[PDB]
Design an enzyme around this catalytic site. Structure first.
Site, PDB file in Angstrom:
ATOM      1  N   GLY A   1      18.407  67.860 -89.439  1.00  9.58           N
ATOM      2  CA  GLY A   1      19.521  67.031 -88.900  1.00  9.58           C
ATOM      3  C   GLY A   1      20.800  67.891 -89.130  1.00  9.58           C
TER       4      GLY A   1
ATOM      5  N   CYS B   1      21.643  71.002 -87.997  1.00  8.75           N
ATOM      6  CA  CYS B   1      22.035  71.625 -86.896  1.00  8.75           C
ATOM      7  C   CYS B   1      23.276  71.167 -86.075  1.00  8.75           C
ATOM      8  CB  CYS B   1      21.142  71.610 -85.504  1.00  8.75           C
ATOM      9  SG  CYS B   1      19.477  72.586 -86.059  1.00  8.75           S
TER      10      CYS B   1
ATOM     11  N   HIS C   1      19.585  72.919 -77.739  1.00  5.29           N
ATOM     12  CA  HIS C   1      18.436  72.491 -77.909  1.00  5.29           C
ATOM     13  C   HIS C   1      18.199  70.830 -78.212  1.00  5.29           C
ATOM     14  CE1 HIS C   1      18.432  73.488 -82.083  1.00  5.29           C
ATOM     15  NE2 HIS C   1      17.858  72.180 -82.534  1.00  5.29           N
TER      16      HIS C   1
HETATM   17  C1  LIG Z   1      18.432  71.762 -87.379  1.00  2.35           C
HETATM   18  C2  LIG Z   1      18.176  70.541 -86.846  1.00  2.35           C
HETATM   19  O1  LIG Z   1      18.743  69.528 -87.254  1.00  2.35           O
HETATM   20  C3  LIG Z   1      17.619  70.002 -85.547  1.00  2.35           C
HETATM   21  C4  LIG Z   1      16.376  69.063 -85.198  1.00  2.35           C
HETATM   22  C5  LIG Z   1      16.373  68.718 -83.986  1.00  2.35           C
HETATM   23  C6  LIG Z   1      15.404  67.384 -84.034  1.00  2.35           C
HETATM   24  N1  LIG Z   1      16.451  66.230 -84.057  1.00  2.35           N
HETATM   25  C7  LIG Z   1      15.608  64.958 -83.672  1.00  2.35           C
HETATM   26  N2  LIG Z   1      14.408  64.657 -83.353  1.00  2.35           N
HETATM   27  O2  LIG Z   1      16.365  64.013 -84.026  1.00  2.35           O
HETATM   28  N3  LIG Z   1      16.766  71.307 -85.043  1.00  2.35           N
HETATM   29  C8  LIG Z   1      15.594  71.955 -85.594  1.00  2.35           C
HETATM   30  O3  LIG Z   1      14.880  71.495 -86.553  1.00  2.35           O
HETATM   31  C9  LIG Z   1      15.248  73.184 -85.241  1.00  2.35           C
HETATM   32  C10 LIG Z   1      15.009  73.482 -83.687  1.00  2.35           C
HETATM   33  C11 LIG Z   1      14.605  74.625 -83.318  1.00  2.35           C
HETATM   34  C12 LIG Z   1      13.203  75.037 -82.740  1.00  2.35           C
HETATM   35  C13 LIG Z   1      12.855  76.393 -82.531  1.00  2.35           C
HETATM   36  C14 LIG Z   1      13.539  77.271 -82.433  1.00  2.35           C
HETATM   37  C15 LIG Z   1      14.958  77.092 -82.734  1.00  2.35           C
HETATM   38  C16 LIG Z   1      15.242  75.762 -83.315  1.00  2.35           C
HETATM   39  N4  LIG Z   1      13.832  73.971 -86.004  1.00  2.35           N
HETATM   40  C17 LIG Z   1      13.900  74.780 -86.734  1.00  2.35           C
HETATM   41  O4  LIG Z   1      14.806  75.505 -87.018  1.00  2.35           O
HETATM   42  C18 LIG Z   1      12.402  75.296 -87.363  1.00  2.35           C
HETATM   43  C19 LIG Z   1      12.120  76.387 -86.173  1.00  2.35           C
HETATM   44  C20 LIG Z   1      10.807  77.160 -86.368  1.00  2.35           C
HETATM   45  C21 LIG Z   1       9.623  76.677 -85.947  1.00  2.35           C
HETATM   46  C22 LIG Z   1       8.518  77.313 -85.945  1.00  2.35           C
HETATM   47  C23 LIG Z   1       8.508  78.593 -86.261  1.00  2.35           C
HETATM   48  C24 LIG Z   1       9.535  79.253 -86.657  1.00  2.35           C
HETATM   49  C25 LIG Z   1      10.832  78.453 -86.621  1.00  2.35           C
HETATM   50  N5  LIG Z   1      12.584  76.269 -88.455  1.00  2.35           N
HETATM   51  C26 LIG Z   1      11.630  75.307 -89.667  1.00  2.35           C
HETATM   52  O5  LIG Z   1      11.320  74.145 -89.263  1.00  2.35           O
HETATM   53  C27 LIG Z   1      11.884  75.797 -90.908  1.00  2.35           C
HETATM   54  C28 LIG Z   1      10.150  76.347 -91.252  1.00  2.35           C
HETATM   55  O6  LIG Z   1       9.541  76.434 -90.078  1.00  2.35           O
HETATM   56  C29 LIG Z   1       8.582  77.447 -90.062  1.00  2.35           C
HETATM   57  C30 LIG Z   1       7.554  76.811 -91.064  1.00  2.35           C
HETATM   58  C31 LIG Z   1       6.547  76.545 -91.614  1.00  2.35           C
END
Ligand SMILES: *CC(=O)[C@H](CCCNC(N)=O)NC(=O)[C@H](Cc1ccccc1)NC(=O)[C@@H](Cc1ccccc1)NC(=O)CCOCC#C
Ligand SMILES: *CC(=O)[C@H](CCCNC(N)=O)NC(=O)[C@H](Cc1ccccc1)NC(=O)[C@@H](Cc1ccccc1)NC(=O)CCOCC#C
Lengths: 305, 305
Positions: free
Chosen positions: B143, B145, B41
């Site tokens: 950041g 991931c 992703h």
């Molecule tokens: C982990 C990381 O560093 C990167 C950020 C990528 C963006 N970087 C840029 N623009 O420079 N990835 C993420 O943050 C993940 C991506 C993702 C999204 C969906 C599914 C799997 C992975 N985001 C999360 O892990 C996020 C996912 C999620 C969103 C909504 C509902 C359930 C899960 N989890 C969180 O953000 C922690 C709390 O989220 C739920 C609430 C409130």
């Protein structure tokens, strides 16, 4: 999200670890530029520790008596001296992996990462606090002498600890890199034991903040107290007294959570007086005191930037 | 002596961490030989995560859309492919620092070390256990991931985990290095919930042994129990069942202490029923289940060698 006992990345120190052998005695050394640093009792045998005369035992050996080995390459020693309880071996080759570094003396309450080593090879890394009684609750096996403690800031490694001994309670003691012990301990076979310890109050507060940043808020109350009010309960539970300098240090976390320091002290007051209601805080059933305010910020303030 | 949550030394993994940027999306990559491995992703925007078709998103990407930075050195991308949920970026230069390594898929119950990174830069190292419900309880900020989990044996690094996401409960999920998620999770922004977690019974026992070796014995008792009777008590407190495989794996510890596994089990069923009551074990007021028998053996079993 998430808060764990986290060590500093250890790559920069690993490439400095060597093995020092003098006779049948082996331990670890730290190789920085053209000098190897290690505990001076490598120059002793078992019987020497009954009453070691280190000035004398040093004059009696020469450079060839020391075998320094980095990986498998033998380093040639071309000089030796003693500073307090540390031995310094000059060698003919400078370590190409030497990081930017400083020698610092940490205060009680402060934390560092230990890189535990055996025969010159790193085996594990973990985080320690210097207890109020100048010991550390490490994990060490035979042959770990000379393993070092450090902090990294920027790309600069601050070395603050070198491991020398295990005391009877199974806690550990050692020196700074100038060779001065922390605490009233000595490298001789004589009666020694750690004194009375106390709980590091400013660290317990920093940890409660970490909890809140991570969503654990059950222990919060609406109450507040005075610095004086708080230090009376602190005494009743073997907590060291809270100073205004400690209140200032907690500034960053109080700012991030919007909870004033004396508000968090009221929460802590209730926990000491009424217990943790069979609940956990960041995965512990006990009040934790080995995280400094800076250890929380490093791991927690990233969301605020 | 002592017992401490202890990570493997991170230097060999440090030398493999890079920053991978696609458009305005950034995360961490793992540079082994001439391939960079990272979460797929990275090729998405937040708007794409609502309903991504990764195969289509990847067609619209040219090699030049990928900016890989190893420190401050740009590595030119020569190819991009997808394997399950990991992206593989072929680059023009093999990492001179690539260690001996393997990709392994680990079992629930087992532990590994996490090197937490941001922007290709290591920040800290700590120990984790893959929970029974295939989640891990880490420290992963924005950041993080593409950070990886690993074990080191001899000079060989076995990578087992790559971080992809935090669940709405605050725990963390990811893949092996072939891109297959641990557990029923998906890299899409949808509702997904971790099953009920259970306690890792063999690990709690291994820890009780380490506590005994370390001098803690207030909880030992003269009564015994059977593997079936223990397991009835175990079902009622969300403890996973204990098998004969687990009894065997605890053999070396049982021998060291000469305390049969089933006697320790009787101790454990006692702590399970009533409780501890103000007393502690290895410094903890909870039953710890994130140490494997091997973890314990490697910190505590040096005495017998
Ligand atoms: C982990 C990381 O560093 C990167 C950020 C990528 C963006 N970087 C840029 N623009 O420079 N990835 C993420 O943050 C993940 C991506 C993702 C999204 C969906 C599914 C799997 C992975 N985001 C999360 O892990 C996020 C996912 C999620 C969103 C909504 C509902 C359930 C899960 N989890 C969180 O953000 C922690 C709390 O989220 C739920 C609430 C409130
Ligand atoms: C730490 C290390 O690797 C080296 C081993 C020396 C070289 N040995 C070989 N085979 O090459 N150092 C030790 O093992 C220390 C040396 C020492 C001795 C006396 C004072 C200070 C340091 N030994 C210990 O740390 C020992 C110290 C001690 C001895 C007597 C009384 C009090 C403390 N601690 C232990 O042996 C564990 C037992 O605790 C002591 C008690 C009771």
């Amino acid at each position: 999200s998430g808060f764990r006992k986290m060590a500093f990345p250890s790559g920069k120190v690993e490439g400095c670890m060597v093995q020092v052998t003098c006779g049948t005695t082996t331990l670890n050394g730290l190789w920085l530029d053209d000098v190897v640093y290690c505990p001076r009792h490598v120059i002793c045998t078992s019987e020497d520790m009954l009453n070691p005369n280190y000035e004398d035992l040093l004059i009696r050996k020469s450079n060839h008596n020391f075998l320094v080995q980095a990986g498998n390459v033998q380093l040639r020693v071309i000089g030796h001296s003693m500073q307090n309880c540390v031995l310094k071996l000059k060698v003919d080759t400078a370590n190409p992996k030497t990081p930017k570094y400083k020698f610092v003396r940490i205060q009680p309450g402060q934390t560092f990462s230990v890189l535990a080593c055996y025969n010159g090879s790193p085996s594990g890394v973990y985080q320690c606090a210097m207890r109020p009684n100048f010991t550390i609750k490490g994990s060490f096996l035979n042959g770990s002498c000379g393993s070092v403690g450090f902090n990294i800031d920027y790309d600069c490694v601050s070395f603050c600890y070198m491991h020398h001994m295990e005391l009877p309670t199974g806690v550990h003691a050692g020196t700074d890199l100038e060779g001065n012990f922390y605490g009233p301990f000595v490298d001789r076979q004589t009666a020694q034991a750690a004194g009375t310890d106390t709980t590091i109050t400013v660290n317990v507060l920093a940890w409660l903040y970490a909890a809140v940043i991570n969503g654990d808020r059950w222990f919060l109350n609406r109450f507040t107290t005075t610095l004086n009010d708080f230090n009376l309960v602190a005494m009743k539970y073997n907590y060291e007294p809270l100073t205004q300098d400690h209140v200032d240090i907690l500034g960053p976390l109080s700012a991030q959570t919007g909870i004033a320091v004396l508000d968090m002290c009221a929460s802590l007051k209730e926990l000491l007086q009424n217990g943790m209601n069979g609940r956990t805080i960041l995965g512990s059933a006990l009040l934790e005191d080995e995280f400094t305010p800076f250890d929380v910020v490093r791991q927690c303030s990233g969301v605020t930037f």
